[PDB]
Design a protein around this motif. Structure first.
Motif, PDB file in Angstrom:
ATOM      1  N   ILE A 112      -2.521  -3.238  -2.585  1.00  0.00           N
ATOM      2  CA  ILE A 112      -3.775  -2.868  -1.951  1.00  0.00           C
ATOM      3  C   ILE A 112      -3.991  -1.383  -2.266  1.00  0.00           C
ATOM      4  CG2 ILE A 112      -5.068  -2.731   0.234  1.00  0.00           C
ATOM      5  CD1 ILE A 112      -4.282  -5.562  -0.730  1.00  0.00           C
ATOM      6  N   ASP A 113      -4.967  -1.081  -3.130  1.00  0.00           N
ATOM      7  CA  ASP A 113      -5.100   0.247  -3.745  1.00  0.00           C
ATOM      8  C   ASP A 113      -6.513   0.494  -4.257  1.00  0.00           C
ATOM      9  OD1 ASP A 113      -4.324   2.745  -4.585  1.00  0.00           O
ATOM     10  OD2 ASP A 113      -2.870   2.063  -6.046  1.00  0.00           O
ATOM     11  N   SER A 114      -6.779   1.725  -4.688  1.00  0.00           N
ATOM     12  CA  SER A 114      -8.112   2.126  -5.146  1.00  0.00           C
ATOM     13  C   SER A 114      -8.571   1.340  -6.357  1.00  0.00           C
ATOM     14  CB  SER A 114      -8.162   3.615  -5.513  1.00  0.00           C
ATOM     15  OG  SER A 114      -7.125   4.358  -4.893  1.00  0.00           O
ATOM     16  N   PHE A 115      -9.873   1.348  -6.578  1.00  0.00           N
ATOM     17  CA  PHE A 115     -10.445   0.856  -7.818  1.00  0.00           C
ATOM     18  C   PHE A 115     -11.439   1.942  -8.225  1.00  0.00           C
ATOM     19  CE2 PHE A 115     -13.624  -1.241 -10.371  1.00  0.00           C
ATOM     20  CZ  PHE A 115     -12.957  -2.178 -11.125  1.00  0.00           C
ATOM     21  N   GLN A 165       6.283   6.932  -3.554  1.00  0.00           N
ATOM     22  CA  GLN A 165       6.287   7.357  -4.942  1.00  0.00           C
ATOM     23  C   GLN A 165       5.461   6.473  -5.879  1.00  0.00           C
ATOM     24  OE1 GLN A 165      10.986   8.767  -4.517  1.00  0.00           O
ATOM     25  NE2 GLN A 165      10.090   8.541  -6.556  1.00  0.00           N
ATOM     26  N   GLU A 166       4.316   5.981  -5.419  1.00  0.00           N
ATOM     27  CA  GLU A 166       3.473   5.175  -6.301  1.00  0.00           C
ATOM     28  C   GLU A 166       2.850   6.056  -7.372  1.00  0.00           C
ATOM     29  OE1 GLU A 166      -0.035   5.167  -6.603  1.00  0.00           O
ATOM     30  OE2 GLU A 166      -0.220   3.443  -7.914  1.00  0.00           O
ATOM     31  N   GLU A 167       2.542   7.297  -7.000  1.00  0.00           N
ATOM     32  CA  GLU A 167       1.765   8.185  -7.864  1.00  0.00           C
ATOM     33  C   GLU A 167       2.577   8.738  -9.026  1.00  0.00           C
ATOM     34  OE1 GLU A 167      -1.279   8.343  -7.835  1.00  0.00           O
ATOM     35  OE2 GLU A 167      -2.179   8.381  -5.834  1.00  0.00           O
ATOM     36  N   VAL A 168       3.885   8.483  -9.010  1.00  0.00           N
ATOM     37  CA  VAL A 168       4.757   8.969 -10.079  1.00  0.00           C
ATOM     38  C   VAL A 168       5.527   7.820 -10.712  1.00  0.00           C
ATOM     39  CG1 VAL A 168       4.982  11.327  -9.214  1.00  0.00           C
ATOM     40  CG2 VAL A 168       6.579   9.576  -8.384  1.00  0.00           C
ATOM     41  N   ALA A 205       0.856  -1.183   0.000  1.00  0.00           N
ATOM     42  CA  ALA A 205       0.000   0.000   0.000  1.00  0.00           C
ATOM     43  C   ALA A 205       0.897   1.240   0.000  1.00  0.00           C
ATOM     44  CB  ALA A 205      -0.915   0.013   1.220  1.00  0.00           C
ATOM     45  N   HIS A 206       0.605   2.205  -0.871  1.00  0.00           N
ATOM     46  CA  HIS A 206       1.474   3.386  -0.990  1.00  0.00           C
ATOM     47  C   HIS A 206       1.151   4.506  -0.010  1.00  0.00           C
ATOM     48  CE1 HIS A 206      -1.073   6.202  -3.367  1.00  0.00           C
ATOM     49  NE2 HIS A 206      -1.548   5.111  -3.936  1.00  0.00           N
ATOM     50  N   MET A 207       2.206   5.192   0.421  1.00  0.00           N
ATOM     51  CA  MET A 207       2.101   6.249   1.428  1.00  0.00           C
ATOM     52  C   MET A 207       1.946   7.630   0.811  1.00  0.00           C
ATOM     53  SD  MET A 207       4.958   5.107   4.246  1.00  0.00           S
ATOM     54  CE  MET A 207       6.380   4.989   3.162  1.00  0.00           C
ATOM     55  N   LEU A 262      -7.949   8.969   0.708  1.00  0.00           N
ATOM     56  CA  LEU A 262      -8.384   7.590   0.846  1.00  0.00           C
ATOM     57  C   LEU A 262      -7.458   6.733  -0.012  1.00  0.00           C
ATOM     58  CD1 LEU A 262     -12.275   7.910   0.726  1.00  0.00           C
ATOM     59  CD2 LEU A 262     -10.726   7.630   2.705  1.00  0.00           C
ATOM     60  N   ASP A 263      -7.170   7.239  -1.199  1.00  0.00           N
ATOM     61  CA  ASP A 263      -6.176   6.647  -2.067  1.00  0.00           C
ATOM     62  C   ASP A 263      -4.825   7.216  -1.664  1.00  0.00           C
ATOM     63  OD1 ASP A 263      -4.589   5.795  -4.209  1.00  0.00           O
ATOM     64  OD2 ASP A 263      -5.175   7.521  -5.421  1.00  0.00           O
ATOM     65  N   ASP A 264      -3.989   6.455  -0.963  1.00  0.00           N
ATOM     66  CA  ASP A 264      -4.215   5.044  -0.620  1.00  0.00           C
ATOM     67  C   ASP A 264      -4.029   4.897   0.899  1.00  0.00           C
ATOM     68  OD1 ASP A 264      -4.577   2.217  -1.028  1.00  0.00           O
ATOM     69  OD2 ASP A 264      -2.460   1.911  -1.469  1.00  0.00           O
ATOM     70  N   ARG A 265      -4.526   5.866   1.669  1.00  0.00           N
ATOM     71  CA  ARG A 265      -4.418   5.772   3.128  1.00  0.00           C
ATOM     72  C   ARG A 265      -5.375   4.724   3.698  1.00  0.00           C
ATOM     73  NH1 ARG A 265      -1.755  10.967   3.852  1.00  0.00           N
ATOM     74  NH2 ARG A 265      -0.300  10.848   2.092  1.00  0.00           N
TER      75      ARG A 265
HETATM   76 CO   LIG Z   1      -3.360   4.663  -5.313  1.00  0.00          CO
END
Ligand SMILES: [Co+2]
Ligand SMILES: [Co+2]
Ligand SMILES: [Co+2]
Ligand SMILES: [Co+2]
Ligand SMILES: [Co+2]
Ligand SMILES: [Co+2]
Lengths: 326, 326, 326
Positions: free
Chosen positions: A221-224, A198-201, A60-62, A166-169
């Protein structure tokens, strides 16, 4: 602390891609009395349970999306760059928190009054922090500081949570929960929990993780993103979702089938579908069977992104069963 | 079995990216008697010849472009997303085979008659399978099933073949022919033949393969889109073509020289040129010397993609010569 | 000897307007043993049942839409003209059968790959037959030869048939069926069955017929384009349709009433509505009560035009009852 309360706490912590320190710290704060942990050269937080062969990696990304200060203007305003995907329509007329080395400051991205017809692009926008000149501004903020939106936290009709991050807390919260529930049990091989950077980049923390770790199964474990004609019959409130295919990957069909079987075995309502974007799991398509698991999320990547609390509760149940049965 | 019939056999089998089962099983059936083989955890089919250091890898992909069922409409039509690159113009008014667990069903993507101006984009299209309701359709087809065009097979004036899937089933057939011909020969060290998965969605099969093999030379056997002002003097019927540069890579110039030299020494007519796209060989450009070897193909990524049989014959001879002399 | 097999057999025979020989020959083969017939100077095939006053005429057309070869390019491709109404969107990237005096050749209308946005007009398209030059091509094909699409044949969920040429090969089959079912019975007056030519290019065969026959009632058996806001509640599966108004005529209302009444009298489910296009019946509006009787067809004038087998079953019963009772 109820789930609502945990989501509020972790979503309120500021930390864009590359600047995840404050979230890592807090995860450390409430995992430390339960499990040992280490921190990567890039900043991933890793917790290993069990021993032996690496069986499962959960990621899960921070990081959250946000703004990077690139410079200060003569009028004392802050120019900025976007970090991660953000619709320019969501930048206009907004409060922000400006995060600096010394502390956190209120900022404001303005709007032009009717008294004084198109989407203003990010490069024409600035942050107003109440400085009267470049010198006054450089005293408060420096280039390469960052900003994220101020975050209203809402609960809709007792069942939904809306708030930026929420994404991705939600994913962070879920893994912490799983860690506490699992530390005292004996597990086959190692089950690895990783809170990535750095998941978002471009999944940078995940890719780093991919040297160093070689799991049989690798999960994000991430958004859909939901809902539209692309997302079939996936619905908020109908359970966690197997993200079978997105823009980054066709995930392991073998692994999806196992997950689906394990959920049914345990009476866990579950959904499967296709959506947009990528996850950390795609960084392991290289070596492991990979899959993404989610709760569906509405209005993704805005201040009003929304999840159903029941999907999340079920997601935590599912993650634990996989740790036992997969 | 002529080359015509071997081509038709392998092109008629449905298998989009991530769904290559049926092609792999048939390749095994064809290669079982002649050599040992292994199947990757991502689904690559690998055949080693010889012993020692890994001299040459040849890759040809099993996946074809096609459609992924995303959902079912209220009237029992199938919604879908594209897999691999397909011009929307080619989706309208077409027969399909929808592939499900329980077998293969007929489907149709409609067209609106004059009786009742622009290209209709993929997301406004649906597949008609003769269901009258969402409920009846679900009994037949599920989300994450897939579809592929029905396939006419044409032979133009004795020497050209036209059908969907020549890319890259021509390469599949070429490599099988090479295995059969080289298995009863001593040539060392190791010559590896891989039938790859997920080439059409970012070379995923090859990137996985790259973590398990480290050859001196890595070849892709694939299409060379022809012809246009970009492709210089490459013509169908003038022989195999060295795909020296494309959008994914500037391949090894020294490897191209050796191949050029080996071709000329064996009296094999051969061509060299620039085209668009990528190939599996680029997944090895961080570790091996890479090149793509092709036959020129017209109307690539459509139902009427066309190759010249004689180029195919010569490519097979070229591949064997490389096994012996590279 | 299923209905599905008859549809397939008759749809697969090539014959555009003005070039109906192959179809007429096959209809002659099928009725040869059952009734006498005449062929007029334009190509119509006429079968007369009974003796006396000309009571009923039934017309179904033998011609399909297609391409007329107009010339041969320097590079040996075939230029062409459209015959009958075809959406240009359906020509791009297609297999064709080119029909010559010498035989049937494979052909292809290409598509340009992404590797090398708008609808490409018919006049910008050519057929590739694998000739290397004008000279070689002219040995294979000449101007005034013709071409039709290669035809897939699909059955959808057991009850729908889809293929190019249901219009109007379903009508041809329907009339053959009725001729067999009526020949061993005594009718009032004459009932005339005509398989017309050149329907798709302005009803030329029927216009020719109208100078040689003067029936009290003139029926066209032809498609009914469905479904849109224009067609009301007409739907496939709900029975034969009375095509009461189209673009070519407001047909005889009292004749519609009679058919309606004979249908109910026989417990035959039936529909009525408005659609686009014209029919052979329109050529007799000059001199007779006129009506057109149909099955509803989806995706008319494409490779995926679709009918419901029950609608066709019922239309045949209706025609036979009309012969007895009209
Ligand atoms: Co995400
Ligand atoms: Co995100
Ligand atoms: Co391709
Ligand atoms: Co290819
Ligand atoms: Co017509
Ligand atoms: Co017609």
């Amino acid at each position: 602390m109820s789930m609502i309360e945990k989501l509020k706490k972790f979503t309120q912590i500021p930390g864009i891609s590359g600047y995840e320190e404050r979230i890592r710290e807090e995860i450390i704060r409430e995992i430390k009395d339960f499990a040992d942990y280490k921190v990567d050269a890039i900043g991933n937080l890793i917790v290993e349970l069990g021993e032996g062969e690496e069986r499962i990696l959960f990621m899960a990304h921070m990081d959250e999306i946000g703004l990077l200060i690139t410079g200060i203007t003569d009028e004392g305003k802050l120019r900025f760059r976007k970090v991660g995907g953000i619709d320019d329509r969501l930048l206009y007329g907004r409060h922000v928190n400006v995060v600096t080395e010394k502390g956190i400051l209120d900022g404001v991205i303005g709007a032009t009054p009717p008294h004084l017809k198109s989407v203003i692009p990010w490069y024409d926008l600035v942050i107003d922090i109440g400085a009267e000149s470049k010198e006054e501004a450089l005293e408060l903020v420096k280039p390469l500081d960052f900003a994220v939106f101020k975050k209203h936290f809402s609960v809709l009709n007792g069942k939904y949570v809306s708030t930026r991050g929420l994404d991705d807390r939600f994913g962070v919260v879920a893994l912490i929960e799983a860690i506490k529930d699992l530390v005292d049990h004996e597990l086959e091989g190692k089950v690895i929990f990783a809170f990535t950077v750095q998941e978002e980049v471009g999944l940078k923390g995940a890719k780093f993780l991919a040297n160093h770790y070689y799991p049989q199964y690798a999960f994000a474990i991430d958004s859909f993103a939901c809902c539209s004609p692309l997302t079939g019959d996936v619905k908020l409130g109908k359970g966690p979702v197997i993200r079978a295919v997105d823009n980054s990957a066709i995930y392991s069909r073998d692994l999806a089938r196992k997950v689906w079987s394990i959920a049914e075995k345990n009476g866990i309502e579950i959904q499967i579908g296709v959506t947009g974007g990528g996850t950390d799991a795609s960084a392991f398509q290289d070596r492991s069977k990979t899959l993404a698991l989610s709760v569906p999320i509405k209005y993704l990547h805005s201040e009003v992104e929304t999840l159903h609390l029941n999907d999340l509760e079920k997601l935590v149940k599912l993650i634990e069963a996989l740790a036992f049965e997969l």
